A = this chain, B = another copy of it.
Amino acid sequence: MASKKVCIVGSGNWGSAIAKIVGGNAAQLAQFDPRVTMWVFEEDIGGKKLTEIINTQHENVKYLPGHKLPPNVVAVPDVVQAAEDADILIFVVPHQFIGKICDQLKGHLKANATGISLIKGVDEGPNGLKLISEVIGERLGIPMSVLMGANIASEVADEKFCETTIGCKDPAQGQLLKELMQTPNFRITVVQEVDTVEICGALKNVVAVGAGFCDGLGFGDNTKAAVIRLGLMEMIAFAKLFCSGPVSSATFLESCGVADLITTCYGGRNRKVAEAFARTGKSIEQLEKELLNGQKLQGPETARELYSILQHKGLVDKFPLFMAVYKVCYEGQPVGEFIHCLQNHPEHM
């Protein structure tokens, strides 16, 4: 008869927007315990501890400016303590933290704890492509779902209408996650093809990096719309080859696909840094420190992992858009040469 307890593992820009949504729904819905924990990697802010400011001011202005968090969301600095009693864990931490967090939580979760990942990126390893949700699911021994959609955090925090896609193999779990996260302005469509929904989130960032390049070279909407289109073609082709199980084009018409591509190529961080990289000579790394609190962008890292994955099978040449993004970010290909990967692009794949 107990309500489900929810832990939000992460507290950045997206984790915070999510805390806002989850906090308000947990308090509004009986099936969820009003107390929502949020694991916050402790920080020093003017001599005050971040978690103390959050639980006192009820805001995380450093990562989510201009918004309060509902009072029932409690910032907890120790991940084990944050996640321990949770029945539902929402993974929304930067890719570089996942390994240690799981490998901190392993064996300390509730018996039938459930998981959902919001991280956009991929992992690799012998065999090739490895989904981040499967890595978390396996180390922690829990069932996993994903949430991926056109969700620039600052707009979600403002309650501007938008949608998202939840990938989940279990219908009841899927319905529970929808009840947990949906609001009148954050609409959710649940689909069962988890792997494709997840790969969409990872890949859309590579295409967004290339759209930022063209932005930095001075191009407009006709060009960006073409980057998105060819980028969508390579994304569907890549998923059919590397995703295990059934993969359908149709899934790319969900928010996780065509829409996240559009919103990310127009207003995401990967695009912004790609543009500045095109106009300034600064490296991706330095721009991240300069524009994104030193946060690791996943667009480039994913292109790097795709390069490796395509290299093992000898397919690098079949993904000119993905590979030009890779070469510009890692191998000094001049950004000014970007258009050539669109100019001779295969017509269909």
Interface residues of A (CB under 8 A from B): 150-152, 155-156, 160-163, 184-185, 187, 189, 214, 218-226, 228-229, 232-233, 236, 249-250, 253-255, 258-260, 262-263, 266-267, 339, 342-343, 345, 347-348
CB distance from A223 to the nearest CB of B (A): 5
Q: Report the Cα distance A224→B161, complex, angstroms.
A: 9
> Are B150 and A225 within 8 A (Cβ)?
yes
Which B residues are in CB contact (< 8 Å) with A228?
258-259, 262
Nearest-CB distance from A105 to chain B (Å)?
A: 31
B residues in contact with A155, CB < 8 Å: 219-223
**B221–A161 touching, CB < 8 Å:** no
Question: A348 to chain B: which residues have CB within 8 Å?
Answer: 189
Which residues does chain B contribute within 8 Å of A218, judged by CB atoms? 160
Contact A262–B161 (Cβ < 8 Å): no
> Are B226 and A162 in contact, with the CB atoms below 8 A?
yes
* Contact across chains for A221 and B262 when beta carbons are under 8 A apart: yes
Chain B: CB-nearest residue to A252: B253
B-chain residues with CB within 8 Å of residue A223 when the two chains form the complex: 155, 160-162
Least CB distance, A93 to chain B, in whole angstroms: 22
A selection of 17 A-B contacts at a CB cut-off of 8 Å is: A151-B222, A155-B221, A155-B223, A161-B342, A163-B229, A221-B263, A222-B263, A224-B262, A224-B266, A225-B258, A229-B258, A229-B259, A232-B253, A236-B253, A249-B249, A249-B250, A266-B266
